[PDB]
């Protein structure tokens, strides 16, 4: 998964 907000996507 990419783009911004990626780290906290979950």
């Amino acid at each position, epitope marked *: 998964h*990419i*783009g*911004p*907000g*990626r*780290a*906290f996507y979950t």
Partner: antibody
Amino acid sequence: QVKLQESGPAVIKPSQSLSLTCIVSGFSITRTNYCWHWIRQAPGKGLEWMGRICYEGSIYYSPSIKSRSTISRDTSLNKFFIQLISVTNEDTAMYYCSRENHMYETYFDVWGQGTTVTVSS
Amino acid sequence: DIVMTQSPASLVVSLGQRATISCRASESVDSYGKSFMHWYQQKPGQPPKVLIYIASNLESGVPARFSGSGSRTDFTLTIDPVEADDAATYYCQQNNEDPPTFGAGTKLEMRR
């Protein structure tokens, strides 16, 4: 407003653990969206990324220092750290910590002054 | 990871002239319809400062003679006209996918 300051040992013996502390100030490491990063710049070379710890505690490590470091943080004191075990000359560099609005912007907008660390006897 | 390669590795541009630094990525740094790559500048003994973000946007405070453009895998930072104050190293970074990677920098030294 925000201010970040790196604290750490000016000199450290080879094969010993280096641990720096970044004291965020005038802003907190738990506000949503932001991620806090560690970046170093070996002298006379380019910037090099190391790892980040995001507001909700999520952590990511540069592969190269992944097997020999841990990024933790202290919610109470409002500051995050990094430890590199068994340092070597390759570890002499300038270390900075900064902030990213991970959710919208994605670029590091506030950087600390970055302390210097020299691995030596 | 996406490797960012900058070119030239260093250049001497004369005052008033224009300098065209470029940054290329091994793989597209695109998502949500934008290019997530920024440009920093680093005067000596100074942490880098953002100049341009998300490919073409200018950070406040940065003069209008700076301007980047490009998409997917080809990006360019242009400084026209160079000014005494631009003598520094410039980096490009991708933050579209992990781990975020930087470029090796382009040292601009200008002629007087």
